[PDB]
Design a protein around this ligand. Structure first.
Ligand code: HPZ
Ligand code: HPZ
Ligand code: HPZ
Ligand code: HPZ
Ligand code: NA
Ligand code: NA
Ligand code: NA
Ligand code: NA
Lengths: 283, 283, 283, 283
């Protein structure tokens, strides 16, 4: 599978969205699993999940790697509401357009926020819920905020450079040897190709600060079976939030990977794939 | 499989042990997995692991449910050293007697301490290491100690009664509906059948308090791939110790079950069996 | 100072309360400090704060040790709303009746909940806010709930006995040598003298479970300078809630006493008195 | 009081030290309080404690602001052992040279490590122990390590610049408005004046990594009354280590300041001074 061979576009129409272009990468034909990416400069579905798409398709799922609004090849947008919710509206728009009744969701960081908001807003449209270090769940009991990684994410949005990108990826990943030229060049291309996304993200963030994303009080509404993953060494979203989700969601479990930053699906892809596929099949 | 059909005895000779009788329950014939039980009155291998033995044997392992010294049908003993270490010596004694070169270990609570000590003392004799809420790892950063459950364990040792046993099991398990008459009668029979074990446990505990069990400082020596499990609702061994192990053992992961006390292998048997079998096969 | 010499009654009329009798103990004539007690059987203002009233009066404060509705010598009541809020309404009723414009509040456990609700509902009527292990702030990130101490508090409400009272106090206090016959007999007398309070508490608790008390989401509204204290060894209200308050209230500090249960003002009276008086004078 | 008027030098001779020059700033004549600084580039006694020296002297103490070996105006040194211990040896050397029998110690970060090692090695020579976010106490249960601030401290040691110094101070302090030109120019002068200290620090750190500083296992030996302070927002030394000390030292208390980085004695000087003076007088 390649980005090119799996690349698709769909126009969505949900609430605020009118004829809004969503890019996604699709493979497989079984039960639908929609995978949702983080909010860093240059993020997108394919780059975030390229180590996961194959095994999930092999396991028999239909995998959709979605570009959230204002990222990668989806349309540009300035958001005045918290991104988790707006993003979830876009997932519903995509599912309606593609005639998908229910989907399992997988989301890291911003994508975890998207997935939480979707489960809250459209409980009849979700299967299982897989969350990797979801962002926006209020203060940490231990970590000073903004987190180290979030400071770098804002620095790169405001003053994009290849050097600052490398600095951000060094904080993002636990194992520095994973930062190949291929990874760097790829993310840098996505940043260079869509400068408007960077500008728009910063305007959006002013309009709706991270505090507005906090859906903690509503977590008791979630009836989806939930699998929470965390990197032990995540410098972007605090580990204690894994506990917050575990205590507040009715049917959840928590898996923490050692030697792992904020990209567990990439850093620990084999174990992540096995655990999540097992969860989807058997939980 | 039944307790009777799987029941075996072996005399061990390791360090302090001379012609010491160890009872165990064995089934299967593949790679050896030795499962080690907790330290509560009436504990033993079969009762602790009866929901696990079948699936592990089905998966192709040789399962040995070991009775630790001073429990169930193994010989009575008064220990002057911390039980984790003495217990680990007994595992080695059993393996030598049965000509087993390496074993995967599974242990909860006291059995987790046994398994940690074994990995430390005999690193050439262990495969993978599976730890469920291991006891004795020093103070908690959050929980007042002695833990609520430990107070009840000592109360039942000192003044055994069916009522106090039920009180202890109510704290041990998250879901109260799991406390059937079968469970209660079974544990009560093991308590009634070996009063000497109760007396000896209390003498042992005076000679080597829980502080003596703390092997935290040596955790960096462990080279075994390690899978740590915890019940979110464990009132016997504090949840933050799962983090302690995750930060201090080189290659570990942590899985926390929601709605789960100190007997995760029984309370969440299906998920526990699937996760641990996957770990043994693929990690 | 004695209970008898300081004993007063005042009828209150606030919202739901009509000609409702509130008992309190008053001494001193400076700035008013209202001290609010916990929710255990037999609790009351004088017994909870008798080691604190003298030093605060010596420091120049007017101290009011208030009996909350449904405790000690205040009127009996069945509450259908969370007690923190109803209790706070009663504090306002008392202050209005006594022509007190602003008060500093001190409250432990249930009384901490009362004080938080008061600061939220009547921000113009509070000076400084002193909180000792306040109850009802939602789940713990570490402690299984209901807490060990809360289980015993409900057991004593339902089946009052001198033995169960002693068991509860053993969990309440860190240092067992503090449990004198005087303490036990005193609390037992308050329990024996007002059986209706026990019955009513249990009815109230069914109508408004501890979850209803959770004001976490509103903590950002508190503008009062806040001093949070915790016992390291509190088995009634979880230590991590001290962190929750510290991160969520604008101007707070946290002081944790070692070797201390849920009655820090009594167990560590000298240090508590010095710290809180310094805070009132200088913060 | 000024740096110049209080400036003194003393040659020390303790274990490895031979005629080793120690610089310190002294004022007052009562009970001796030795204050010990952190390990950042350009750190020293006067700059670290200039908001504290006056009030402590006013309270009646003899205050010695000590420059640790390899900092500020003390002699250059390459250390092959953990700095906490070597530093503590230097404190003893100073006390012996000045005929001081016992001292109260105050230390932040590296200085907290110095003070812990001193209490362990010379328990007959310490009064009370005041610890502000002491460094080197092993892994955090929550924070990825090396901490954000420690990364910047090493960056500034290796590539000193005014810009990198400002970046470090921005992480060091919670309130950015405290970073005046006076603060920056002062620290920069100390860095420019002693380049050899920077080079030597980096050589020392290679010889004895932060892991070597971990004295956790010995904390039970400390008999000194101990006051632990932490900044809620400390990005250099993890907040949970305040809990570690509180559970492991016999007679400790913990005070956490909100809106506070790694320099609590400067960021919250008034409250810090009041609390520590009260502790020295009355605990
Ligand atoms: O998208 C990425 O891969 C990336 O580099 C960082 C993602 C950061 C987040 O999505 C995020 C969102 C909210 C809070 C914390 C973190
Ligand atoms: O063995 C059992 O099943 C049981 O009821 C309790 C086990 C308790 C422990 O083994 C234990 C050991 C050390 C510390 C904490 C807990
Ligand atoms: O009032 C007392 O002294 C007592 O024994 C226990 C108090 C318990 C509480 O007030 C309480 C309230 C809500 C949650 C936890 C604890
Ligand atoms: O000395 C300073 O003021 C400074 O900027 C940083 C101090 C850092 C430490 O001493 C330190 C030492 C060990 C671990 C963590 C932190
Ligand atoms: Na490489
Ligand atoms: Na049943
Ligand atoms: Na006594
Ligand atoms: Na300014």
């Amino acid at each position: 599978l390649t980005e090119s061979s799996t690349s698709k576009f769909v126009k969505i129409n949900e609430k605020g969205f009118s004829d809004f272009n969503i890019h996604y990468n699709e493979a497989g034909n079984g039960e639908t699993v929609i995978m949702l990416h983080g909010g860093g400069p240059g993020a997108g579905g394919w780059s975030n999940y390229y180590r996961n798409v194959g095994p999930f398709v092999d396991a028999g799922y239909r995998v959709i790697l979605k570009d959230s609004p204002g990222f990668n090849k989806s349309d540009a947008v300035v958001m005045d509401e918290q991104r988790g919710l707006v993003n979830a509206r876009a997932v519903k728009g995509l599912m309606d357009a593609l005639d998908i009744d229910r989907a399992h969701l997988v989301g890291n960081a911003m994508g975890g926020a998207t997935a939480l908001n979707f489960a809250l807003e459209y409980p009849d449209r979700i299967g299982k819920l897989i969350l990797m270090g979801p962002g926006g769940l209020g203060p940490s009991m231990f970590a000073p905020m903004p987190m180290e990684g979030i400071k770098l994410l804002f620095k790169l949005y405001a003053e994009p450079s290849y050097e600052t990108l490398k600095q951000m990826l060094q904080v993002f990943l636990y194992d520095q040897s994973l930062i190949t030229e291929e990874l760097l060049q790829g993310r840098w291309e996505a940043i260079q190709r869509q400068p408007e996304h960077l500008k728009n993200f910063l305007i959006s963030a002013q309009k709706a600060p991270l505090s507005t994303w906090d859906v903690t009080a509503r977590l008791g509404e979630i009836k989806a079976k939930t699998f929470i993953t965390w990197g032990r060494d995540d410098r972007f979203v605090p580990l204690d939030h894994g506990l917050k989700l575990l205590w507040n969601i009715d049917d959840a479990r928590l898996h923490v990977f050692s030697k792992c930053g904020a990209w567990a699906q990439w850093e620990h892809a084999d174990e992540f794939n096995r655990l999540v596929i097992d969860f989807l099949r058997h939980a």
